[PDB]
Amino acid sequence: KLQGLVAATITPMTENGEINFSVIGQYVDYLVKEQGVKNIFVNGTTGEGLSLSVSERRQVAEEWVTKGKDKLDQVIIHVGALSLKESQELAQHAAEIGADGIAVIAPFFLKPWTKDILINFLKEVAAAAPALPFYYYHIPALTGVKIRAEELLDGILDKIPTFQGLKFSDTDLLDFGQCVDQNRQQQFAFLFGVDEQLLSALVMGATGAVGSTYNYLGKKTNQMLEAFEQKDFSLALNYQFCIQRFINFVVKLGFGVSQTKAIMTLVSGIPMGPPRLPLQKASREFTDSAEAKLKSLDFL
Amino acid sequence: KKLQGLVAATITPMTENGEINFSVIGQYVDYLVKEQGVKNIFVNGTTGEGLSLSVSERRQVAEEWVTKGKDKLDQVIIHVGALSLKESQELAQHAAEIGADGIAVIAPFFLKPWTKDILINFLKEVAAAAPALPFYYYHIPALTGVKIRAEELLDGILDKIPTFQGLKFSDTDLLDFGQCVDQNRQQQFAFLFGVDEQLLSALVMGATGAVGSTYNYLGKKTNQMLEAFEQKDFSLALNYQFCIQRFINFVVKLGFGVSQTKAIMTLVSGIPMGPPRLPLQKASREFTDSAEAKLKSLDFLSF
Amino acid sequence: KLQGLVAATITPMTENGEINFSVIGQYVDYLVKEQGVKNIFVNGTTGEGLSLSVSERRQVAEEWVTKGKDKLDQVIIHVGALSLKESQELAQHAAEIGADGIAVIAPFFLKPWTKDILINFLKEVAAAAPALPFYYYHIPALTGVKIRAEELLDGILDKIPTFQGLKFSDTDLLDFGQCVDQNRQQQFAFLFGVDEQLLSALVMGATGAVGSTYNYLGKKTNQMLEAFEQKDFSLALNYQFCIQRFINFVVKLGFGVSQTKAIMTLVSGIPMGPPRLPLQKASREFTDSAEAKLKSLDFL
Amino acid sequence: KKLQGLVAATITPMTENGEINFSVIGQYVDYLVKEQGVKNIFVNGTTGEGLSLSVSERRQVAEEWVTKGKDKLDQVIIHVGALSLKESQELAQHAAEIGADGIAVIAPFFLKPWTKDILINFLKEVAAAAPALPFYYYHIPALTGVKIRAEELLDGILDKIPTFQGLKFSDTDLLDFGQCVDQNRQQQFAFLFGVDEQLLSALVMGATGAVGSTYNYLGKKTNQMLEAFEQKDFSLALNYQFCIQRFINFVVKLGFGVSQTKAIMTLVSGIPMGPPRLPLQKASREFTDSAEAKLKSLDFL
């Protein structure tokens, strides 16, 4: 079962903007040894997934899977794309290379009008990897798709037999809570996606978390998870607050994927390089401010 | 004194002709105390259709609640927010005159304040009309559309609003709420969470109480959750939260707002809340029957 | 027939924040003589209408109606409020003082769920002034009510016999166009509310316009209106662009009701005074920048 | 060589299996020219389900449009926008190779550009893959969510993107559109308006043409409106706009997206557009029959 922390991996790049495949081995080793992170989620927003071409996405997924062998428990490939054909190609490829699962965002240019139409899209991608675990990536802020996750999940196995869970990037814990509450007999992964309030989702039954911060705050987040598991909710909150102090600070400065790349470079010592347009590399001012904040909170 | 635990956002009972039914407020207070274990109320909020009422109506109904709450409720908090500063000041002064326990103010949302500091200045001028009354900020961005974060508003707030004593936070952003709690440890603030259907998630983030409409008729069940949390029976607290979520999600799917709350309260309490005022529309017979059947099936109401 | 430019009037205030009734006569004279504006719309957003108490709204409506006698063609009082009772009081009062009409915004605290419910609210206000022309103030950006104006108008006379038109503050000209096209027999005023693109609504059948800029750009706007009426569309567009150059400039700086108040004071020489909280008086940086731009465009 | 007047945003015909039906593109080109008076097309835009197609499909269908458009259409403009810069560069270079008349690029909207200047840097890199081809910006904030105003983007654009030749503006903000026109008088840019249902409102603000889905099947009627406007018969122009609005508003109330456009084109032209690709769903029989009755009632059939 896909459980605990799942790092949404950054796509390291060379200064010329090509993917830097050569540091992915180091990155896997670092997640496992320094962050206590055993699972990754490849080519999501943090990995600039949809800024990469289909061939780039295949090539980098190959690197994560092969470098993750006998080191990471699970490598999940985000295979979402605006083109169903391209998503199908990526899903089939993920099965071919022996990824542990695939995830799919709802297409978000021409949006699905209904639940049923979205499910039909998802089913056709899942069917391209018909024995691979399939996870829905719920992220309404990005997609504009208003369909509630608990409703999407209702009877989903009848349509998508490889359905195995949800990455829920949304703060509606009625919806998340009812995903958990209404699907007790399915052994689904209920993975929460809003790092800055993970504790609030743990109390409602999250079985793990997928997020960008686990790349460089995995140790402290694991301490929070362990405190929660020990029923020390006061202690777990104190640990959550440490994390919140950092995230709240950088969000006020201007905090997106570019800034995450810069922070990972700073904390890990592994060069993530610049982001790809339409992202812009983080400023020196941001990186200095973030470094100082990390140090003051004992994250660095 | 500190405002804590459950605070029921009270309904404004009305006659079939749309006038306030003052006559049932005493009964309502007694019912909250005896049947729901609710010791605090929040008057003329969204649940109370506060801003649908005239200033004269708001004064009259606040008087009735304060009077009927005497020696029965711990705290009666009057929402005195209005689009007009002048009217809000009038209501704040009146709340002090009648001996309400505190006042709350929503951000004005006809012409929205451009910045935190401008909003603070509006809030300050209202608070200063009741200079011996605890003041609470009512944060509800889904309604107001005011994109000012509560933790930013709270930062150094006592320097501008010396009566500031806390926050009603009706929003699901628990980074904002969490940092309200985390950054304001010395000030003795009430951190009251406003989204009933995920209260347990806010309790784990340091909420000191809750303000909401469901406590009118689910206060007893919610108090069981609070007590489970206090005892560190977190598994039991979650079970209770889920039972509440099963009801709320059911009614949200059907269409669930203030009108429906009025109908549900009438059903559960037997006290006639009456119709809502336009632009709300009375809840349907189908809705009320469905809610009843759900409540019975969850053992929130008797067969 | 309510037609041509209608100034959405500012509420002059004393430095201590009370209404400065003493300058309203001067303001009316200025509108008629210097701006060529013969109609006003009182206590809209520009008038900080809903920042005023019911009593203040009565008082200032009285001053506008009295000072407008034999000078303005029409004085329209915005009587919208969140409280139906307050709206009804203000409507009755507008009828008592002999205002030429009333206008009503949809209440926007608890929004009407449906068209029928909104019309029922409007009907109950209109019925308090049962022989006074009634105008709907459509402004979905403020109210969040998303029902199309053409749908709201369909059959409206059956429930609101005093209905005589609308102020349309929205850029959807399919909706505005169809308001005009579908209501040809009823002699309605189709008043456009987005000053910065007035010409675009004139060509679609607008019978007039209600806005803040006509307080201080009425002369130029009337030249545009006259060019449009005479079919000189090249000249109409050039005059529209003059106005747009100013508005585009100030919107980039931050442009709302407070800034309108400051601009009116600068242009007219009549002291509008400070705005009421939650508005804040315009900055010196704003007024210096705006003054320079008005001069560069021959508006000052 | 100036892109002006109507530009039909072309549909991607598909067979029932969802594969591209290349075989009817010649027929479609002839229909546009003969029956609709449309001389320009905009390929693989929203109406074309462009971002639902793979890069290989977009190349193939662009080839077919360019080939079948030779000596028939005045201009074939290829939308080469993509979320991936590398993919957009490939499509831009390909459009130049096949002899397309121009390219257009939407702002990427997966991870949105923080500023005008960062968006320009993306657009510049795509334009630079087709460095002799006219470049058009495709502005459609309702779909992308990118809150960067067109007039700000256009301001001094030629210094960064020397092939910049105009704008497809699919937005109702005519302060933005008006200032695009007003502030760029020296440039000979195409100011193509993208909201068909209110085109007349943009014509009065200085639009030099229009790009849209309705010109596939209402092009003849829209050309009558354009002619009335150019001939200073503005009352006639409004009458024509209102007739078009009666149809569009009728379908807007029912649910009017790309699926419905495919079905209406099939109905009007007799050329089979086929179903749309997921995540779109084919229009209903009810809808098609309703649209047919409405078109007949307005003498559009």
PDB file of N, CA, C and O in Angstrom, chain B residues 59-103:
ATOM      1  N   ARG B  59     -31.478  46.207  17.255  1.00  0.00           N
ATOM      2  CA  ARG B  59     -31.451  46.667  18.656  1.00  0.00           C
ATOM      3  C   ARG B  59     -32.477  45.909  19.495  1.00  0.00           C
ATOM      4  O   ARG B  59     -32.140  45.397  20.567  1.00  0.00           O
ATOM      5  N   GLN B  60     -33.705  45.807  18.989  1.00  0.00           N
ATOM      6  CA  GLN B  60     -34.786  45.156  19.732  1.00  0.00           C
ATOM      7  C   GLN B  60     -34.466  43.694  19.990  1.00  0.00           C
ATOM      8  O   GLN B  60     -34.675  43.186  21.096  1.00  0.00           O
ATOM      9  N   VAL B  61     -33.981  42.998  18.969  1.00  0.00           N
ATOM     10  CA  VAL B  61     -33.758  41.570  19.132  1.00  0.00           C
ATOM     11  C   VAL B  61     -32.536  41.301  20.014  1.00  0.00           C
ATOM     12  O   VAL B  61     -32.567  40.371  20.827  1.00  0.00           O
ATOM     13  N   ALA B  62     -31.490  42.130  19.910  1.00  0.00           N
ATOM     14  CA  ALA B  62     -30.358  42.051  20.833  1.00  0.00           C
ATOM     15  C   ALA B  62     -30.799  42.233  22.295  1.00  0.00           C
ATOM     16  O   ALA B  62     -30.365  41.485  23.175  1.00  0.00           O
ATOM     17  N   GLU B  63     -31.679  43.209  22.543  1.00  0.00           N
ATOM     18  CA  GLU B  63     -32.224  43.414  23.889  1.00  0.00           C
ATOM     19  C   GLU B  63     -32.914  42.165  24.421  1.00  0.00           C
ATOM     20  O   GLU B  63     -32.708  41.786  25.587  1.00  0.00           O
ATOM     21  N   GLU B  64     -33.720  41.529  23.582  1.00  0.00           N
ATOM     22  CA  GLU B  64     -34.445  40.344  24.001  1.00  0.00           C
ATOM     23  C   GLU B  64     -33.465  39.211  24.329  1.00  0.00           C
ATOM     24  O   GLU B  64     -33.580  38.557  25.374  1.00  0.00           O
ATOM     25  N   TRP B  65     -32.485  38.984  23.457  1.00  0.00           N
ATOM     26  CA  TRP B  65     -31.498  37.928  23.736  1.00  0.00           C
ATOM     27  C   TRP B  65     -30.707  38.170  25.016  1.00  0.00           C
ATOM     28  O   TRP B  65     -30.480  37.230  25.786  1.00  0.00           O
ATOM     29  N   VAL B  66     -30.253  39.405  25.231  1.00  0.00           N
ATOM     30  CA  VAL B  66     -29.472  39.723  26.427  1.00  0.00           C
ATOM     31  C   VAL B  66     -30.331  39.516  27.683  1.00  0.00           C
ATOM     32  O   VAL B  66     -29.879  38.914  28.675  1.00  0.00           O
ATOM     33  N   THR B  67     -31.555  40.016  27.622  1.00  0.00           N
ATOM     34  CA  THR B  67     -32.492  39.921  28.747  1.00  0.00           C
ATOM     35  C   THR B  67     -32.803  38.468  29.070  1.00  0.00           C
ATOM     36  O   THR B  67     -32.681  38.053  30.220  1.00  0.00           O
ATOM     37  N   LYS B  68     -33.180  37.697  28.057  1.00  0.00           N
ATOM     38  CA  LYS B  68     -33.501  36.289  28.254  1.00  0.00           C
ATOM     39  C   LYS B  68     -32.297  35.391  28.568  1.00  0.00           C
ATOM     40  O   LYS B  68     -32.456  34.327  29.172  1.00  0.00           O
ATOM     41  N   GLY B  69     -31.104  35.823  28.171  1.00  0.00           N
ATOM     42  CA  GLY B  69     -29.876  35.135  28.497  1.00  0.00           C
ATOM     43  C   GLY B  69     -29.351  35.365  29.914  1.00  0.00           C
ATOM     44  O   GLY B  69     -28.497  34.621  30.369  1.00  0.00           O
ATOM     45  N   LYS B  70     -29.837  36.403  30.594  1.00  0.00           N
ATOM     46  CA  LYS B  70     -29.343  36.766  31.924  1.00  0.00           C
ATOM     47  C   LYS B  70     -29.502  35.584  32.892  1.00  0.00           C
ATOM     48  O   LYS B  70     -30.564  34.981  32.964  1.00  0.00           O
ATOM     49  N   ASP B  71     -28.408  35.245  33.574  1.00  0.00           N
ATOM     50  CA  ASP B  71     -28.346  34.127  34.530  1.00  0.00           C
ATOM     51  C   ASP B  71     -28.645  32.752  33.941  1.00  0.00           C
ATOM     52  O   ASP B  71     -28.980  31.829  34.682  1.00  0.00           O
ATOM     53  N   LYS B  72     -28.504  32.606  32.620  1.00  0.00           N
ATOM     54  CA  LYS B  72     -28.760  31.342  31.937  1.00  0.00           C
ATOM     55  C   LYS B  72     -27.631  31.019  30.980  1.00  0.00           C
ATOM     56  O   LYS B  72     -27.035  29.950  31.061  1.00  0.00           O
ATOM     57  N   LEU B  73     -27.346  31.950  30.072  1.00  0.00           N
ATOM     58  CA  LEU B  73     -26.153  31.865  29.216  1.00  0.00           C
ATOM     59  C   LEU B  73     -24.943  32.495  29.878  1.00  0.00           C
ATOM     60  O   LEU B  73     -25.080  33.496  30.579  1.00  0.00           O
ATOM     61  N   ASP B  74     -23.759  31.928  29.627  1.00  0.00           N
ATOM     62  CA  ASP B  74     -22.500  32.540  30.050  1.00  0.00           C
ATOM     63  C   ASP B  74     -22.244  33.827  29.267  1.00  0.00           C
ATOM     64  O   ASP B  74     -21.899  34.852  29.854  1.00  0.00           O
ATOM     65  N   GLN B  75     -22.351  33.754  27.933  1.00  0.00           N
ATOM     66  CA  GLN B  75     -22.065  34.910  27.079  1.00  0.00           C
ATOM     67  C   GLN B  75     -23.068  35.109  25.946  1.00  0.00           C
ATOM     68  O   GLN B  75     -23.469  34.150  25.275  1.00  0.00           O
ATOM     69  N   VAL B  76     -23.483  36.361  25.767  1.00  0.00           N
ATOM     70  CA  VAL B  76     -24.287  36.774  24.615  1.00  0.00           C
ATOM     71  C   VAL B  76     -23.418  37.755  23.838  1.00  0.00           C
ATOM     72  O   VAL B  76     -23.068  38.827  24.336  1.00  0.00           O
ATOM     73  N   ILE B  77     -23.044  37.366  22.617  1.00  0.00           N
ATOM     74  CA  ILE B  77     -22.197  38.184  21.759  1.00  0.00           C
ATOM     75  C   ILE B  77     -23.079  38.721  20.645  1.00  0.00           C
ATOM     76  O   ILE B  77     -23.754  37.944  19.978  1.00  0.00           O
ATOM     77  N   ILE B  78     -23.072  40.037  20.451  1.00  0.00           N
ATOM     78  CA  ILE B  78     -23.872  40.659  19.403  1.00  0.00           C
ATOM     79  C   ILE B  78     -23.000  40.983  18.187  1.00  0.00           C
ATOM     80  O   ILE B  78     -22.016  41.737  18.281  1.00  0.00           O
ATOM     81  N   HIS B  79     -23.380  40.429  17.045  1.00  0.00           N
ATOM     82  CA  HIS B  79     -22.776  40.853  15.792  1.00  0.00           C
ATOM     83  C   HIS B  79     -23.339  42.232  15.450  1.00  0.00           C
ATOM     84  O   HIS B  79     -24.528  42.369  15.191  1.00  0.00           O
ATOM     85  N   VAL B  80     -22.476  43.246  15.448  1.00  0.00           N
ATOM     86  CA  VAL B  80     -22.869  44.627  15.191  1.00  0.00           C
ATOM     87  C   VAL B  80     -22.358  45.136  13.829  1.00  0.00           C
ATOM     88  O   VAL B  80     -22.476  46.332  13.523  1.00  0.00           O
ATOM     89  N   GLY B  81     -21.814  44.225  13.013  1.00  0.00           N
ATOM     90  CA  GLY B  81     -21.311  44.584  11.699  1.00  0.00           C
ATOM     91  C   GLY B  81     -22.403  45.115  10.790  1.00  0.00           C
ATOM     92  O   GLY B  81     -23.547  44.658  10.829  1.00  0.00           O
ATOM     93  N   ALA B  82     -22.054  46.121   9.994  1.00  0.00           N
ATOM     94  CA  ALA B  82     -22.973  46.703   9.022  1.00  0.00           C
ATOM     95  C   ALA B  82     -22.126  47.294   7.921  1.00  0.00           C
ATOM     96  O   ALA B  82     -20.935  47.562   8.115  1.00  0.00           O
ATOM     97  N   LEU B  83     -22.740  47.536   6.781  1.00  0.00           N
ATOM     98  CA  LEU B  83     -22.019  48.222   5.717  1.00  0.00           C
ATOM     99  C   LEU B  83     -21.733  49.683   6.063  1.00  0.00           C
ATOM    100  O   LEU B  83     -20.730  50.239   5.617  1.00  0.00           O
ATOM    101  N   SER B  84     -22.614  50.285   6.849  1.00  0.00           N
ATOM    102  CA  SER B  84     -22.444  51.666   7.305  1.00  0.00           C
ATOM    103  C   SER B  84     -21.702  51.712   8.622  1.00  0.00           C
ATOM    104  O   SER B  84     -22.171  51.162   9.620  1.00  0.00           O
ATOM    105  N   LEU B  85     -20.574  52.400   8.652  1.00  0.00           N
ATOM    106  CA  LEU B  85     -19.826  52.590   9.898  1.00  0.00           C
ATOM    107  C   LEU B  85     -20.709  53.189  10.985  1.00  0.00           C
ATOM    108  O   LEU B  85     -20.666  52.759  12.143  1.00  0.00           O
ATOM    109  N   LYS B  86     -21.507  54.180  10.598  1.00  0.00           N
ATOM    110  CA  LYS B  86     -22.368  54.895  11.532  1.00  0.00           C
ATOM    111  C   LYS B  86     -23.343  53.951  12.207  1.00  0.00           C
ATOM    112  O   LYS B  86     -23.571  54.014  13.433  1.00  0.00           O
ATOM    113  N   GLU B  87     -23.928  53.070  11.413  1.00  0.00           N
ATOM    114  CA  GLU B  87     -24.873  52.098  11.937  1.00  0.00           C
ATOM    115  C   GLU B  87     -24.175  51.068  12.826  1.00  0.00           C
ATOM    116  O   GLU B  87     -24.703  50.712  13.872  1.00  0.00           O
ATOM    117  N   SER B  88     -22.991  50.627  12.416  1.00  0.00           N
ATOM    118  CA  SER B  88     -22.224  49.678  13.210  1.00  0.00           C
ATOM    119  C   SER B  88     -21.865  50.278  14.578  1.00  0.00           C
ATOM    120  O   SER B  88     -21.983  49.608  15.599  1.00  0.00           O
ATOM    121  N   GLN B  89     -21.458  51.547  14.576  1.00  0.00           N
ATOM    122  CA  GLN B  89     -21.170  52.299  15.819  1.00  0.00           C
ATOM    123  C   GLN B  89     -22.394  52.414  16.716  1.00  0.00           C
ATOM    124  O   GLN B  89     -22.296  52.219  17.934  1.00  0.00           O
ATOM    125  N   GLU B  90     -23.541  52.688  16.112  1.00  0.00           N
ATOM    126  CA  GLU B  90     -24.802  52.755  16.843  1.00  0.00           C
ATOM    127  C   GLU B  90     -25.094  51.433  17.544  1.00  0.00           C
ATOM    128  O   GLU B  90     -25.433  51.404  18.721  1.00  0.00           O
ATOM    129  N   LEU B  91     -24.953  50.342  16.807  1.00  0.00           N
ATOM    130  CA  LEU B  91     -25.224  49.012  17.329  1.00  0.00           C
ATOM    131  C   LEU B  91     -24.196  48.610  18.397  1.00  0.00           C
ATOM    132  O   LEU B  91     -24.550  47.948  19.370  1.00  0.00           O
ATOM    133  N   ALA B  92     -22.938  49.002  18.210  1.00  0.00           N
ATOM    134  CA  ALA B  92     -21.901  48.713  19.200  1.00  0.00           C
ATOM    135  C   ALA B  92     -22.186  49.435  20.525  1.00  0.00           C
ATOM    136  O   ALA B  92     -22.136  48.801  21.583  1.00  0.00           O
ATOM    137  N   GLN B  93     -22.517  50.727  20.447  1.00  0.00           N
ATOM    138  CA  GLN B  93     -22.863  51.510  21.641  1.00  0.00           C
ATOM    139  C   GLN B  93     -24.067  50.912  22.349  1.00  0.00           C
ATOM    140  O   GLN B  93     -24.097  50.793  23.575  1.00  0.00           O
ATOM    141  N   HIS B  94     -25.062  50.518  21.568  1.00  0.00           N
ATOM    142  CA  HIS B  94     -26.260  49.896  22.109  1.00  0.00           C
ATOM    143  C   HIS B  94     -25.956  48.579  22.830  1.00  0.00           C
ATOM    144  O   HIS B  94     -26.479  48.328  23.921  1.00  0.00           O
ATOM    145  N   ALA B  95     -25.108  47.747  22.225  1.00  0.00           N
ATOM    146  CA  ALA B  95     -24.695  46.497  22.851  1.00  0.00           C
ATOM    147  C   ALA B  95     -24.034  46.721  24.211  1.00  0.00           C
ATOM    148  O   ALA B  95     -24.267  45.946  25.131  1.00  0.00           O
ATOM    149  N   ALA B  96     -23.219  47.765  24.326  1.00  0.00           N
ATOM    150  CA  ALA B  96     -22.596  48.138  25.609  1.00  0.00           C
ATOM    151  C   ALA B  96     -23.663  48.610  26.605  1.00  0.00           C
ATOM    152  O   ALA B  96     -23.639  48.211  27.771  1.00  0.00           O
ATOM    153  N   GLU B  97     -24.610  49.420  26.135  1.00  0.00           N
ATOM    154  CA  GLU B  97     -25.712  49.942  26.979  1.00  0.00           C
ATOM    155  C   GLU B  97     -26.552  48.839  27.616  1.00  0.00           C
ATOM    156  O   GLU B  97     -26.895  48.913  28.805  1.00  0.00           O
ATOM    157  N   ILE B  98     -26.862  47.813  26.829  1.00  0.00           N
ATOM    158  CA  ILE B  98     -27.697  46.710  27.289  1.00  0.00           C
ATOM    159  C   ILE B  98     -26.937  45.633  28.029  1.00  0.00           C
ATOM    160  O   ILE B  98     -27.564  44.743  28.582  1.00  0.00           O
ATOM    161  N   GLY B  99     -25.608  45.703  28.029  1.00  0.00           N
ATOM    162  CA  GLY B  99     -24.789  44.759  28.785  1.00  0.00           C
ATOM    163  C   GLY B  99     -24.631  43.426  28.088  1.00  0.00           C
ATOM    164  O   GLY B  99     -24.651  42.375  28.722  1.00  0.00           O
ATOM    165  N   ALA B 100     -24.455  43.459  26.765  1.00  0.00           N
ATOM    166  CA  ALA B 100     -23.965  42.288  26.046  1.00  0.00           C
ATOM    167  C   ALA B 100     -22.569  41.962  26.546  1.00  0.00           C
ATOM    168  O   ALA B 100     -21.859  42.839  27.075  1.00  0.00           O
ATOM    169  N   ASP B 101     -22.155  40.715  26.355  1.00  0.00           N
ATOM    170  CA  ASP B 101     -20.846  40.259  26.824  1.00  0.00           C
ATOM    171  C   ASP B 101     -19.715  40.583  25.856  1.00  0.00           C
ATOM    172  O   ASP B 101     -18.530  40.594  26.232  1.00  0.00           O
ATOM    173  N   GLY B 102     -20.080  40.889  24.614  1.00  0.00           N
ATOM    174  CA  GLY B 102     -19.090  41.235  23.614  1.00  0.00           C
ATOM    175  C   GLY B 102     -19.771  41.583  22.311  1.00  0.00           C
ATOM    176  O   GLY B 102     -20.979  41.389  22.169  1.00  0.00           O
ATOM    177  N   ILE B 103     -18.985  42.113  21.389  1.00  0.00           N
ATOM    178  CA  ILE B 103     -19.455  42.467  20.058  1.00  0.00           C
ATOM    179  C   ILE B 103     -18.547  41.865  19.020  1.00  0.00           C
ATOM    180  O   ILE B 103     -17.350  41.675  19.260  1.00  0.00           O
TER     181      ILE B 103
END
